[PDB]
Design an enzyme around this catalytic site. Structure first.
Site, short mmCIF file in Angstrom:
data_model
loop_
_atom_site.label_atom_id
_atom_site.label_comp_id
_atom_site.label_asym_id
_atom_site.label_seq_id
_atom_site.Cartn_x
_atom_site.Cartn_y
_atom_site.Cartn_z
N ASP D 4 -47.18 92.12 10.37
CA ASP D 4 -46.57 92.49 9.11
C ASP D 4 -45.48 93.69 9.57
O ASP D 4 -45.18 94.70 9.17
CB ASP D 4 -47.65 93.35 8.53
N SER D 29 -41.34 98.17 9.21
CA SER D 29 -42.86 97.77 8.69
C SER D 29 -42.92 97.29 7.50
O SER D 29 -42.09 97.97 6.44
CB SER D 29 -43.46 99.54 8.54
N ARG D 30 -43.38 96.09 7.25
CA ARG D 30 -43.39 95.36 6.04
C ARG D 30 -44.13 96.13 4.89
O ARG D 30 -43.99 95.71 3.81
CB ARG D 30 -43.94 93.97 6.06
N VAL D 31 -45.22 96.85 5.35
CA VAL D 31 -45.96 97.53 4.26
C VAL D 31 -45.15 98.65 3.67
O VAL D 31 -45.18 99.09 2.70
CB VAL D 31 -47.39 98.09 5.20
#
Ligand SMILES: Nc1ncnc2c1ncn2[C@@H]1O[C@H](COP(=O)(O)OP(=O)(O)OP(=O)(O)O)[C@@H](O)[C@H]1O
Ligand SMILES: [Mg+2]
Lengths: 132, 284, 154, 166, 165, 154, 154
Positions: D4, D29-31
């Site tokens: 992620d 950070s994909r979050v």
């Protein structure tokens, strides 16, 4: 003796003490020795002869003017060359060029004066290169 | 494929040796250009001394060259390089010439241009500007004589009244990193800046008005020469930093080319062997 | 492995390269990679050898500058190098030649050029005698005289 | 392609003394903000994009005093935020102290301080905040929100008057 | 990885006229000076440093007479030593003649001579040394040492006065 | 072999390249490698086709100069090429576009741009109507009108 | 794969460079290219690390100016740089050291220098305490005290 500095806008050409400085001013020859009167005169495209006793160095000055103060002598020329550093074969090409063009130009043609001037610069370089 | 990358690395690596060296030659010539300017400054200051002495003892002092007129036409000197590889050196100076001519003049008749250097004249001629005289092939670290004919004819044009103001565009040296394009007035001169010098007692042969007739044109002459030497320093600074970058960019590209070469080298060996072993396992 | 092993069995080689064919240089003979056991002063005589090595030196130098020229450009070369590049390109074209069998493909009649004339032609290009003829003049001709003649038509 | 996001560490940064050596351009950070307390999401909002632009514009930074005043200020802010993001090994920071430190530098409170003093300024600032202004730090640990920005600005400027540069 | 060094030959060198086409920079003898007579170990010491400087400065060779006089001379020494190391096929040289030839070029005795004349200068020098100064050559064959440098310098300068470019 | 074999089964392709993504050009679409069976005057109309090919011609030329640019920069280029590079860079930025689904990453609202407007915008850039807008104006916008509007804020 | 897997186990490198050997700097260890995982404040002290990085900064700067010095000369350098070059040259010589195992060949006694003394010596050179000793004093000596002693003999 008096100190002489012959200078072009790019470098100092001759520096030293000198017994006398023979220079062809525009109004006639001048021999500047120590204690000469403060003076400024344009020079003709001629040699300048500098004497140091037995020695005589000869410099091919062109488009210069002489400035004497009580202490020293400055000559600020467009051109100034020592005998050993004058290219003799180039001075003959400069001579040949401007001499053959002079032959046929009208006496108040646009460039008459410029080619007369350039001929004298080369004529002087050939004399000065022989004083070697 | 290694056939390309072998040769692409070769090219960039040879090229980098040349850019690396060219910065080193440009660096040498900047020294020689500032050396010769340290002779030209006192040469011109001495002429200035004699001119400020003659003015200090004439009671009524005036000359055509110090007298400002109504501006009927204008003369523009423009200093550019002959060779490129000098970053935006010529671009910057030419854009400034283009700007200041657009703001001022509404036709080609109002100004006239002296192009010092090939990049300049090529630009101006291509775009049909009034280029009246030129000089190219100026030597790196030049003598005054190489600028003289174009200086004299430009002074000649103001000395009569072909134009009533002479001005010079060049890149002003600051550091080897910085060169600012600028415009400066040459003629008319300003007695505020030509007479501030040490006044001395001299005799004048034939007379003071006669030597002042040679020295004032000889002084304007040296301003043009000073601007050329500043412009040469600016050329060699700009070239130092342009070939500096090209050297760094070449090393950067050599990293990413080495990375690709070695992926390819490794993959050739890896893939070739798998094939040899696959063939042998179809019989064993 | 096939051609690599084949080289051991040969007294002369003519190495054809696609790069030359793509430029229009036929026959497409790599003038540096091609070789002969008898290219020696002992066999072809002293002048032939000197000329051939001269030609190869000029071509090799041009090859080295191809990279530098592509990025830094041709104005930044020395006067010696720009002259070498000029001649190299003329040399490279004078090595091309229309073939009798290729009258269909070239559209021109073929040419047989004897050794004496080949040596003479390349000697003269190296000497500078044809530095003012345009490049196309040397392309697809036989003798040096036909190149001088082709220049007039341009 | 599995994870992620990633944290890329680059050698050039590492050996030049940027440690931890996070390549800001490549890392992500994909979050994202979902995994952050509101205080940190506020102060950091554009931080990554600001430093990515700094690192690109740093190549053309040889023109000190000659370069236009917009880019000059961006380079001066950039060198200081870089110093803040340097961090010694085995010295983790509480979130509340990070938010204050990042708040300080991003709102200009270190712009008059020498670049070489920034790291000591931070250490001295936080020991000041812990000893004297703990009510501000505690707000963040409890609410996850920034305290009153006017109170916070005052408290930093209070600290500043007892700080000796070099 | 097995042998005690290697002699790498290159096509680019060969076709540029460097024959034998030895890449001197990359090639190596792990035994080195131990496999050399004292005369050759002495004169070759300076040849290596001269060519190492040449190979670094070679980028600056298209800038002829823009360069400061120090680097100009290094390029001029370099092109001349390169010419000395060119050598005709099936024409081996005795070590005593090699030592003199390398001594000549590395101590500047060919700096006055055109680059195109260097190889003929060498051939003419050695035929002179063989016919007239064989006592100097023989010193090297017997002792393996250089002769007295003052005698050797004189003998070369003697030859030089009869050489026409 | 996987993607290579997949191409045979497609009527249009969108080829994403990492180099573009790293520059901040999103979506990261290689505008020369991407293809469609229906990019023809018969389907999209005569103007669309002309504009698209115009755009690709400018980008292709820029692509060819990428080696020279990577080392020397733009300073050595001819006046014709400098103009092409200027437009290519504006074109390259106007192909970028904020996505509705990327409101979480970019922080900017997304944009839907109809074909008529896309064609009109790129037509105008090719025609020279926006040669005086700075490059950042075209980056991450929507219609050509939003680029003109963004220029005012710079 | 061979060096890559070997590299995973290395703590340190010692890079011998012929350039240094040719200058007479023995051992010919490249003081910039050589590296160790344990040159950190955690392992050697805080002082050791500070000194070593100080030494490398001075050497690196000197390295950068090598080209500038060779062409523009020493007048072109700032006062800060001239001082750095002075110290760099002393530092470079103080890194040389006579070996016990060369005692037969050099004819000079070898030297063992403990870490405490190495750090102290280079600290003092960086601090300026020996800016007036001549350069030869630092060449082929052990402790800083032996350099002060060698200065008297010159
Ligand atoms: N014969 C010569 N030998 C050496 N240097 C010379 C010679 N002639 C001129 N120079 C130098 O070259 C520069 C050119 O000076 P100038 O323009 O006055 O000469 P010129 O007569 O126009 O030269 P030419 O006609 O031979 O080109 C000056 O720096 C000058 O000292
Ligand atoms: Mg002249």
């Amino acid at each position: 003796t008096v100190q002489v500095d012959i200078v072009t806008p790019e470098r100092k050409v001759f520096q030293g003490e000198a017994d006398i400085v023979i220079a062809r001013g525009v109004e006639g020859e001048l021999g500047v020795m120590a204690g000469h009167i403060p003076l400024v005169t344009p020079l003709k495209t001629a040699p300048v002869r500098i004497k140091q006793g037995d020695k005589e160095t000869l410099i091919a000055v062109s488009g210069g003017f002489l400035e004497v103060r009580p202490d020293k002598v400055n000559i600020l020329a467009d051109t100034a060359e020592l005998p050993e550093e004058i290219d003799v074969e180039r001075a003959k090409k400069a001579k040949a060029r401007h001499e053959t063009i002079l032959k046929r130009l009208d006496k108040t043609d646009k460039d008459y004066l410029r080619h007369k001037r350039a001929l004298e610069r080369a004529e002087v370089r050939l004399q000065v290169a022989n004083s070697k | 494929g290694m056939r390309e990358i072998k040769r692409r690395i070769r090219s960039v690596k040879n090229t980098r040796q040349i850019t690396k060296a060219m910065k080193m030659v440009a660096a040498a010539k900047l020294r020689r250009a500032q050396e010769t300017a340290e002779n030209a400054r006192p040469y011109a200051d001495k002429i200035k001394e004699v001119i400020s002495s003659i003015a200090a003892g004439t009671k009524d002092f005036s000359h055509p060259m110090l007298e400002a007129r109504p501006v009927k036409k204008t003369g523009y000197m423009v200093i550019t390089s002959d060779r490129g590889l000098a970053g935006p050196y010529n671009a910057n100076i030419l854009r400034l010439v283009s700007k200041t001519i657009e703001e001022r003049h509404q036709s080609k008749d109002e100004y006239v241009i002296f192009a010092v250097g090939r990049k300049g004249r090529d630009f101006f001629k291509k775009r049909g500007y009034p280029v009246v005289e030129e000089v190219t092939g100026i030597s790196d670290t030049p003598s005054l004589t190489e600028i003289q004919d174009i200086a004299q004819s430009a002074i000649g044009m103001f000395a009569d009244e072909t134009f009533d103001k002479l001005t010079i565009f060049y890149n002003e040296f600051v550091s080897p990193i910085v060169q600012r394009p600028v415009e400066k007035q040459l003629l008319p001169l300003t007695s505020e800046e030509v007479l501030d010098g040490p006044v001395s007692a001299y005799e004048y042969e034939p007379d003071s008005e006669s030597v002042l007739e040679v020295l004032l044109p000889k002084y304007a002459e040296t301003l043009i020469y000073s601007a050329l030497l500043d412009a040469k320093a600016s050329e060699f600074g700009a070239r130092m930093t342009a070939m500096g970058n090209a050297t760094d960019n070449a090393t950067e590209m050599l990293e990413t080319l080495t990375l690709q070469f070695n992926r390819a080298r490794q993959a050739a060996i890896t893939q070739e062997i798998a094939e040899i072993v696959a063939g042998a396992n179809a019989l064993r | 492995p096939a051609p690599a092993t084949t080289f051991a069995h040969l007294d002369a080689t003519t190495n054809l390269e696609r790069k030359l064919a793509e430029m229009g240089i036929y026959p497409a003979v790599d003038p540096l990679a091609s070789t002969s056991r008898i290219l020696s002063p002992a066999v072809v005589g002293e002048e032939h050898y000197r000329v051939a090595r001269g030609v190869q030196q000029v071509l090799q130098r041009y090859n080295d500058l191809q990279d530098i020229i592509a990025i830094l450009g041709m104005d930044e070369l020395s006067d010696e190098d720009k002259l070498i590049v000029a001649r190299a390109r003329k040399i490279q074209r004078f090595l091309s030649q229309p073939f009798h069998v290729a009258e269909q493909f070239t559209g021109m009649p073929g040419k047989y050029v004897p050794v004496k004339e080949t040596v003479r032609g390349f000697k003269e290009i190296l000497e500078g005698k044809h530095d003012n003829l345009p490049e196309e003049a040397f392309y697809m001709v036989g003798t040096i005289d036909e190149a001088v003649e082709k220049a007039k038509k341009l | 392609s599995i994870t992620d996001g990633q944290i890329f560490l680059e050698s050039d940064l590492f050996y030049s003394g940027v440690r931890p050596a996070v390549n800001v351009g490549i890392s992500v950070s994909r979050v994202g903000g979902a995994a952050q307390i509101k205080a940190m999401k506020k102060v950091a909002g554009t931080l990554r994009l600001d430093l990515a632009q700094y690192r690109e514009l740093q190549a053309f930074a040889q023109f000190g005093s000659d370069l236009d005043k917009a880019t000059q200020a961006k380079l001066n802010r950039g060198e200081r935020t870089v110093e803040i993001l340097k961090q010694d090994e085995h010295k983790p920071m509480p979130v509340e102290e990070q938010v204050i430190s990042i708040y300080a530098v991003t709102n200009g409170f270190m712009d008059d301080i020498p670049v070489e003093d920034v790291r000591r300024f931070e250490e001295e600032l936080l020991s000041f905040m812990r000893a004297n202004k703990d009510s501000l730090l505690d707000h963040i640990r409890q609410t996850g929100e920034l305290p009153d920005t006017k109170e916070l600005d005052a408290a930093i400027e209070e600290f500043k008057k007892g700080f000796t540069p070099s």
